[PDB]
Amino acid sequence: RDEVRAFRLRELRAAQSLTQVQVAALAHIRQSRVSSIENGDIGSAQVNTLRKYVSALGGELDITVRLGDETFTLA
Amino acid sequence: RDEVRAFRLRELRAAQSLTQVQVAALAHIRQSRVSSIENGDIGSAQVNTLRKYVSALGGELDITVRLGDETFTLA
């Protein structure tokens, strides 16, 4: 469900070995929202929020719409 | 531009003969959001809301984190 997702985000921070608070301020994000996404939430977060989280921990967040044969980019 | 991204979305909707008002009802999303997320405010868009919309256009929204060459899926 979201457990898989949660673990997809939890390890971005674990790899830098930073706490949830360190990151909220490294990415400039409410620690509440930071914790919510680490828990496989994400549906209630601005794309921006999510991007910052991932950028902060050295990744590139790519948002795409796949329709039929081809796909389109949003981020 | 993040306004060309969203204008690509406007055309997907239009090609399927749906007005913003219909799209709204279809994904149970406030019509106010759809106009903006169609005016290019993707960053500000709440993820699930943007999920809800892209599917009322018959699409899969696809969120992944690119690290090195390898990329990992969230949505």
UniProtKB/Swiss-Prot annotation, chains A, B:
DNA-binding region(s), residue ranges: 20-39
Induction remark: Induced in persister cells in response to D-cycloserine.
GO molecular function terms attached to this record: DNA binding
Keyword Hydrolase assigned: no
Statement: the UniProt record of this protein carries the keyword DNA-binding: yes
Residues annotated as domain HTH cro/C1-type: 9-64
Keywords, alphabetical: DNA-binding, Toxin-antitoxin system
Job of this protein: Putative antitoxin component of a type II toxin-antitoxin (TA) system. Its cognate toxin would be HigB2.
Protein name, entry field: Putative antitoxin HigA2
Organism this protein belongs to: Mycobacterium tuberculosis (strain ATCC 25618 / H37Rv)
Residue window of the full protein shown: 27 to 101 of 101
